[PDB]
Amino acid sequence: KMVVTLVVTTILESPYVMMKKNHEMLEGNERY
Numbered sequence: 001k002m003v004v005t006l007v008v009t010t011i012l013e014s015p016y017v018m019m020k021k022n023h024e025m026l027e028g029n030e031r032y
Contacts, residue, residue, distance in 0.1 A: 010017040010032065017032050 019032055023031050
């Protein structure tokens with residue numbers, strides 16, 4: 001074919017940053 005040549009940290013405190021429901025299923029940025 002064409003041969004082309006040339007963060008935010010937190011803590012596990014309950015009221016501050018808690019893990020919401022289904023944390024194991026949906027984990028990542030939209031988890032806490």
